[PDB]
Amino acid sequence: NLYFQSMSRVLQAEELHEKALDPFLLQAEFFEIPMNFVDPKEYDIPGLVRKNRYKTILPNPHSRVCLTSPDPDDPLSSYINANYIRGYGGEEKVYIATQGPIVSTVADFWRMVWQEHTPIIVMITNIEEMNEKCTEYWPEEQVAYDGVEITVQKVIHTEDYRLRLISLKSGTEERGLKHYWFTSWPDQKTPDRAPPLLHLVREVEEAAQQEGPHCAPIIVHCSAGIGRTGCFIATSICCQQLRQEGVVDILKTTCQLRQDRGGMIQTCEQYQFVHHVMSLYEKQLSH
Template sequence: MASRLSAEEEQATKQFLEEINKWTSQHGVSPLSWDVAVKFLMARKFDVLRAIELFHSYRETRLREGIVKLQPHEEPLRSELLSGKFTVLGVRDPTGASIALYTAKLHHPSKTGNHVVLQALFYLLDRAVESFETQRNGLVFIYDMAGSNYTNFELDLSKKILNLLKGAFPARLKKVLIVGAPVWFRVPYNLLSLLLKEKLRERVQMVKMADLRQHLPRDCLPEHLGGCLPLDVHSWNMQLLSEQNGRVDPVDELVGIPLENTSIHTPGAEAMSLAELMANLNRAQRSGIYLEYEELRREQPSGSFTCALAPHNQERNRYGDVLCLDQTRVRLKARRNERSDYINASFMDGYKQKNAYIGTQGPLEKTYGDFWRMVWEQSVLVIVMTTRTDEGGRRKCGQYWPQEEGGQEVYGHIAVVSHRVDNHAHYNQTTLELHNTETFEQRQVTHFQFLSWPDYGVPSSALSLIGFLGAVKYQQQWAVQAFGSQWRGHPLGPPMVVHCSAGIGRTGTFCALDICLSQLQDVGTLNICQTVRRMRSQRAFSIQTPEQYYFCHTAILENAQRQGLLSANQ
């Protein structure tokens, strides 16, 4: 394929592969092939940075929707592929673009869940864009609503399809033609159009059946849409399935590893038992642990900070030297008139759980709206704050939530109401209700603030912090159960937001303790050094001082002794 690219495109492909394969190596995912790299670059006109963002959006979308390994010969995906709901026509439009067709009247929400429908869409579109010609010339998507009624329509599914097409799929989307839309579709369409970026909104058009030939010639349209093309969806998709026999899905390499194993925090060969950890601490003493931390501190982050350093984003960073890695940063969803999707926040894995946390800085007044947007968009149920707003006469974090019971504030399009405040010995627990003023949805979030942790220092009582961690995890578990079927991701739920002032010191210590204690409970071993090294690859510079690193060791051992897992004499 390289010979079909210009010299500039080949150079862009090499640069893209160099950047992406740093990430794949770090996360234990198979390196990307040249052909797959070209597919992402074609979709973004060989703009390397935009193609890298597309790669991560695509991969994260598949993981979020649980579409990890597509198995087209197994049910229920096989039946969905043969249902005729989705197909790619065997012709191209006059510009060479492929034409994908979705037939709305064949969808019955009561019989087929969104998960299976999205699997089929991913599979068929992935097969369509394997063609170099389609990559170069793009894709036309026909949303055929002719003959459909309200029982065939599902707003959430339509949102997911448009979100996929607008920014999470490696194809040049030329246009989306919504054909034969019934009168009742006008209100849902207005809601859906708000999701779209301005450029894509221009490409999405509602078209009457009689006017469809103004957009596509008759020989590119099926007979039932006024064209002359015989449509045998079953035969076309059967051929696709027969070609798939013995063939590895080309996009499985992007998702890499099964969903339950995607976290970078899994037991390693050098894990220690509690007795070995105690012996290591006795041998190394505080000075040896401090030296171990110093070695970690000297390791430079593997990744880039391009977005965090962009001039228009720098004012959104609380500290100029605490930045987000491009590879793991949380991206705010696009909104009209918003220049940037940046927030100083990073996805961080937990023990055997991808994106268990969002590590972030203490919100600034100018970023309160961004913070609550992120909480809403990521379905966050629990916020963990490990700092006071002011310490030592210095502002560490803004008062970004209504503190008093009954208080309410509006941040951007999210209204936050404080329903209840419970004061404990070392922390406060506030029950908040979020109202999305655009969608009229509401959601409950619990805010925890730990009060016994001095900046740069460590808590005077390790057990108070571990007790606090237990309360946080219990609330997360309860909230996930209450969230019910609205949450379809990892069984442990959406990410918890964890922050201090900079979002690396106390935040990193809290997360490291949770990861190590979870592994200890699961398999009886842990590795603090490995955990911190891996954590710093996602939220750069996590754990800010040798004292915090040493505290991880002593806190775990103190907790083990309290539980009778170790004697004080060991």
């Protein structure tokens, strides 16, 4: 309740099932959630226009990811359109929500990856949306940006994603990175389109567990880094909530998301989709 009054609607199984199929209650609830967008005039940085895909979708200042290398005192060099996102139970920095890199922000995105020790990237962009919704920021094989050698070591093709196993080398230190490019994001967010997003959420949460204690932030991106990104993150949080608590609170999870980054879960169709995803998971867990 720091940036706005949070809301909550704790759903047990039966109500969750019905709620996902009630678009009139969904839209009534959704359009009461504050967007918590940033006034664009909050950022008065010469050259900032080149860093943002959309002039009105800006990172909230309190949770903004600051690029501290090579100059933390230069407002432009330290800027990236990204925010630290709290996970389940308010765990700090479980994710980073960011826009899909553009030509002028490819090297900045890798600076963020390196600064944050990011082990996993979740890219929610369809094949046909390249390169207008996301610039291809990974190399075909190898590339070096600001002293970091980025190498794509393997491309694992699945039905709903392309997984790239990447190496990051600077000086003597070498780190691994998992890049999950999800290619099945639906235009029509019907229940039959919920299984590929659920599989991705479950794959990524098992991969984040395999990193061991205090997993570094997981980077999630789509075009503006709010809509599809908000859905992925809300689904991931509620999946942990349902297993731990036996209930889901998409409403309170959406409020938690909007407090960290304005516009997280941009549309009502996305809001309803998260309910289709959680209702399905609940049925699957029941067995």
